[PDB]
Symmetry: D4
Amino acid sequence: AELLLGVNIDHIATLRNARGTAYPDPVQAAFIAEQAGADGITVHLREDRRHITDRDVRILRQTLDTRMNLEMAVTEEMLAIAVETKPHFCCLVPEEGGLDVAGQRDKMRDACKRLADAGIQVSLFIDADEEQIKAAAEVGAPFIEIHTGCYADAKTDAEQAQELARIAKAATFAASLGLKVNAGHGLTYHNVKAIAAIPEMHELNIGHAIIGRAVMTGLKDAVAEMKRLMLEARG
Amino acid sequence: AELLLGVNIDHIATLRNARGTAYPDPVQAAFIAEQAGADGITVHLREDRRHITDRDVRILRQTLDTRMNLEMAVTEEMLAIAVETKPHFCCLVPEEGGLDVAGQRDKMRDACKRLADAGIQVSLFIDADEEQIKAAAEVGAPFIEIHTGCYADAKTDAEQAQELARIAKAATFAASLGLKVNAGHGLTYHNVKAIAAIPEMHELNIGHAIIGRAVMTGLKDAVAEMKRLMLEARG
Amino acid sequence: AELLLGVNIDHIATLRNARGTAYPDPVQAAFIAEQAGADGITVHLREDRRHITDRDVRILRQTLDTRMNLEMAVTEEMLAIAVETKPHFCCLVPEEGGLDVAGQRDKMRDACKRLADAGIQVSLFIDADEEQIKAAAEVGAPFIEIHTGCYADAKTDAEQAQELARIAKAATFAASLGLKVNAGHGLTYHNVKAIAAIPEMHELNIGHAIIGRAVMTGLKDAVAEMKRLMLEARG
Amino acid sequence: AELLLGVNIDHIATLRNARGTAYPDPVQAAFIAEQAGADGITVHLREDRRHITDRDVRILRQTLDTRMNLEMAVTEEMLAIAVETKPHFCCLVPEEGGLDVAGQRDKMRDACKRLADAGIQVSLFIDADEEQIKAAAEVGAPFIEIHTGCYADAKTDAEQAQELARIAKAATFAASLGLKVNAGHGLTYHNVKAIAAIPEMHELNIGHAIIGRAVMTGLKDAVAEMKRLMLEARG
Amino acid sequence: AELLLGVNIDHIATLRNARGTAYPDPVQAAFIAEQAGADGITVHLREDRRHITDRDVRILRQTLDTRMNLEMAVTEEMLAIAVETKPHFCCLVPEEGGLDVAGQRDKMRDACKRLADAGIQVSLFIDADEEQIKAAAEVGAPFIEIHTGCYADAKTDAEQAQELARIAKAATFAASLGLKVNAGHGLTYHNVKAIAAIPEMHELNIGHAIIGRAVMTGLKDAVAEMKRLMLEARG
Amino acid sequence: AELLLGVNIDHIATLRNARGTAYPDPVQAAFIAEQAGADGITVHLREDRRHITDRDVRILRQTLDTRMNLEMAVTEEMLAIAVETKPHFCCLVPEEGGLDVAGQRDKMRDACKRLADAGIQVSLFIDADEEQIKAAAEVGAPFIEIHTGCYADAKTDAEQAQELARIAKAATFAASLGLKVNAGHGLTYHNVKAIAAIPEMHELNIGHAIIGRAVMTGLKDAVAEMKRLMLEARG
Amino acid sequence: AELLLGVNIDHIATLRNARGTAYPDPVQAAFIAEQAGADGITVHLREDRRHITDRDVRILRQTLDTRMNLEMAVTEEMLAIAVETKPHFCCLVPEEGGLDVAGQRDKMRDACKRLADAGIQVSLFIDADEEQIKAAAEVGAPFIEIHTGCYADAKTDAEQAQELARIAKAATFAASLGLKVNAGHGLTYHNVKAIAAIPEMHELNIGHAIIGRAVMTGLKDAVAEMKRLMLEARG
Amino acid sequence: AELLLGVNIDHIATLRNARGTAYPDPVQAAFIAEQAGADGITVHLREDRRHITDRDVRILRQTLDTRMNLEMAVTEEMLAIAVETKPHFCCLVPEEGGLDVAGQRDKMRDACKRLADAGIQVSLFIDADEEQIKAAAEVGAPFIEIHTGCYADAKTDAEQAQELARIAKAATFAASLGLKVNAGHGLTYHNVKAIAAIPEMHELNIGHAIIGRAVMTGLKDAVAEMKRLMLEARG
């Protein structure tokens, strides 16, 4: 299968809420992305509705032509919402910045099972850590998403090749356990290739860099450009 | 003279700071705008550096091909900065949301004179209020900028025509006193024309709506589109 | 202000329901048109829900940046719907081609009354007929939309200039009664100007021609094109 | 190895025949598609001539630069027209949705031979069923077109990888019997790749998704996008 | 009123017959221009069928969305074809270069009357010469098209102003005889305006300069740019 | 190695001389193509100077950024011109359609040697016929260009595969004699790939199909699209 | 009333002559500019032939579709070349920066007459000074080109409205003496309008700003932008 | 990872300093290139500050998103500058064309040492010379950039293939010494591939050709174009 590109449109809302108006609208951004090479759309519903709102999730769930990846923390509230919303994907995150699955095997087991019961495919956001990965496999998540943050912030060309290698070994380890593996968070037009080249990678969920390119060149080209780089890497 | 369009790039930074990276960069946005129909660039330096930073102002002041309109509150800090920076324009604002010039004739007189002494053309941000306008004329500002906020938020087609009329009478009053008059703040692609049609209008400083259009269509077209609407109104 | 353009997006949905999939989606088309020169979006909710659906209207009502013009037949169902939807405009059409206001003064008078209590501004779609126009004015409707179908259909240059004269004359008469007047049905890229040249015209609501240009050229350009011909006509 | 794209322009006609004007014209759509990556144009001449008309087929036959793929039901009327027109291909269709070749070996036997004597390369529109494939081979048709509708409608990932498997097996089966195999019908920008990667696939005939993308982006980019996805799948 | 643009697509066919292929096809050129500024399409059916052919004319007559202007020499053949084809316009040309109406008053008189009974508006392609204009008025032709070749070939800027003047006086003279007047032969992007500013001008029929620009920029912009220059001239 | 594309701009001049103007100018067409995928430019200086003229050749020789391929008949005139012009390449053509080298072994032998001393690489335009290939090898020509006309005219899909095969075997045969081989005459957007996939192909010289596409889309994309199809073929 | 744009392509050559390759070629730049709204092309042939060369002028003279404006100093060499080349215009320049006509009435008297006998329309590059204007009139030159350099360099708004006043008076003065007046030299996208609005202005010759915009956006849009600003100023 | 592209923007400034204005601005060009395929930006700070200035470098150092490659002569001035600027890369060039490392082992050894202490990664620009390569490796430099000038200049196909072989061979040898190798000087759109095909190449730093394409076409496309040819070469 072709590498997939999930586009996170949270920052479209960031720009909206810096002024209370209705624009720009994440609903429009999603149509653009789904038609410029995005295979999925990701929104992070935060408990403080600061940036994405219940409305966005509500309409988005009716307007998306592909599928939603709802990013949320593991709280009673969010789980409740997710089960009602029935997103195709759910990515659990904290409130290096990865979920501490290994340290909460019960809570995560309960969440995965529950979301799974609502027909939601679950992804645990975690660091390139085999303990955490082993833990995720064990609690029942069909997916994990490796935090590419440290890799993006690689101050030195060395720290980077090092970070890349850790992610790669982590992914291969994740797949041997039967997990499908995503990445994203921090990837840019300049560092996406090494990650896209990792064979075990299933989908890359990228947000900020794309929105940052969009204010300059427009969303359509920004999304197309990212996808193209991704497929260049694989070929 | 042709109506002028000043583009406020504050929100380019809003989108930048929602992630600490270097992008998107307001310096790039300014080149794009200055070449797509913007006659001036406006940045608001806030005391909490939340969104635009000293760096932006510093580089921008060297990279702008047209001129800077530095938007700031009337504090010792800001005045200090402005005098050092030597912006071509300075727009004083509060910390309907207009400066209370009438109620602070001394502070404003001191500020205007001081900025004027640094060769800075001053603009007082105020409501469509003849008392405030008379006050501004009297304290020495060569410019005022009428807050178009209430007009943009006109809930009813009636409240709007009403708000438009107040702005228009206010402008004509401002000019009789020898003031040059700007507007902007809240204007959109759908309400810019009635304001652009007001003859006394010198420059419209527009920010949010343009950045909101840009994430969809790119900055170049967003700026060009606004300018075109503006010149359609006048002709 | 300037001549307005309302884009009817009904045919986006007729292309959708020809296959029962979710695309194309009227919600997307509305975003595009509103950002390319449309001042309003028109949807006709048929009783058989042939093309537009209650879903489209529901979402559309929350996503439009400008204003919705609901096109509907005068029936208990539609009135109740219009009342709860609270569209900014409601254009009453038949269940030469226009509504028979003269022959149903009672129905129409109450209809307008009922919609006006819900804040909806009513427009009666009628023929370039002085009797119907006078009747419309008498039932209290604030708007009338003149059916330009025959003008469009005109098979000979003469039959066209004639239908044109008949329309201009009607527009003038309706305005003499305090009626604000629209038109647009059947208008094309090649015949829109003469109509747009009529001074009393407030807004042209066009659909088919635009969507038909769109499949070849894209909605954005199709809309900007029409908008430009219209403003050219008044220049 | 070099996948061909056949664009079905039927829906261009549905949009036109919703108004009774000459636009949009299928003849224009074909020129665009043929120059944007289409290798053939398909038109379905229905009995009720609701969408595509005799005129279309007649001019299309003289304007096409590549070749026509005439979709029709097996009747004396349609068969008569086919032999008259001399389309390069003829795709027999019912008027799982597939054509029943097994249950009519004689009708089909005659149809194919008749069309064959007229120089028409015949293709039988069938379901991914071993029975029908064997029938088509035995009956003498050079081509079969596997119905992908079920694969497109598959609600879940698993129900999809399943339908994909059936099609891939059916294509390999078809090929071993000396049959050339096409598909398309239901393919979209989001599911087309998995079908394109099927080695045996000769040509994918696609319509609805392309025309639906076209009302937003324009026919050329719509057709060009699809062709590009297809070649990437084989690359 | 509106200055119209008729695009002569003859040279598209010229480019075709230089290889006896089907491309480029005039039927396509015609769709492009009609959607990019052309108000009409002109084709010269030469007796030897050098450039345009009978099929061109026949299909064109069914595909044109605006109207056809059939250029032809005066011979029973062409007339019969014309009467048969019922093109909206017929511009009689010779096969200075203008049609000699004075020297053939009888023939033309029959032609005009003849074509006029079929319902075809006739125009006589003539030189900016009074004898020929009076001649065309006497004969009953509703239109004349002034040959702009000598103007287009105007070597010096004086020899050129001579031609302009000569064409302008001739146009006013023609109008004074109840004739409607066109022009267009040899007009280019750099000389069209002076001619378009002539008040009496009803439609400019241009071919060569446009096709010549189109090879570089593409037909769409070549047409749109010419229409744009014309409207600028009359503003 | 890299499959090269030589664009024959003859038909640009064809379009020019159809009016004896200066536009369109081949010198311009040449800049466009060289920057859009052409690795060379080909011009056929016909003895009667029908299409291309001496100035064309003369200026072109000073403006081309890549290299010239002068097509010409074998006569003392052309040779002298060639020897004078020092074009990088010279493709000797007749004035099946291929050059008859067998029947003129002597003449060609002198031509090749003659042009070769001026430092001009020579290529003989011949049919996919062994007698002529052996002939061209014997005579000393370093290149041959296989005429692809019969292939391009391939009415049936069989008559076509016959030509492909015939060209492929001929190319391998030519290579086995130490000859380098080109092709290109009559190749289009829909048939170029099969020819480009032939391993022995060194450069495809194409003209007509490109100019034909360019009238619609503009030269730049016409060239870029052809080069793109070619690289796809060899990948 | 219809302002002409003259594009100076000198800087295209400076960029080339910084490397000693054939690119970028002024010949290409001229084709683009002439088709993007330029009415003439200017080239300054300098003694040191540092930028523009003899070759350029030589080919330019044969490729231009509009006309050449040869900029040169008054010397026997340059004058000799002018008479040989026969440029449409010749703009005499020094090699306030303006040409001293007053202080050399004889040289200029002869130069103009000589160029005049060669058919060259002469223009004297002078400062906005009453003395020089009178001299140019008395000396016999048909044109003068007012140096706008000082107006472009004006540091402050007031110093600018001042220089603008001097130019406008000088142009009206020049016109009353029967002189045709041009400008340009220093104009930019940001100051061009005020100069364009000057009624008397015949042609603005611009170079640097346009080429500087061109390296970012491309020559065509650069030239098209400038022409559009100019016409808006007169509109 | 993949072959990198470094864009030298020196010529943007050479177009600027040809007039002393502020445009075009290298800072803008850098943003464009970095977003169109450039992986690095190269600036050559000459001692005479002919084109690039200390200002450009200072700002550029704060605005680049990727990494700066400072090109400089080995002198006390430049070293101190490089040391305080801390560019990611420093490419040492002369004050065949490359640096004489073999003959200045001491200077070079210390230079590298000094720059490496400031964290700068050093590259020595040298000829495809085994002696210089070996010397470079011995002085401790981590990179070498092979001068491709002669390859570029090659006047004959043979002289080119030869210079090519010489370069490939050198690259291989340098890599055998642990040296990472770049190239790019003089590379064009027509000769870049053969070079990019060399496996050891790490990054191509190209300038003139790109800027020269830019004035015609725009920097963005110029850069994306080059980047695409490069990756095509490695495909």
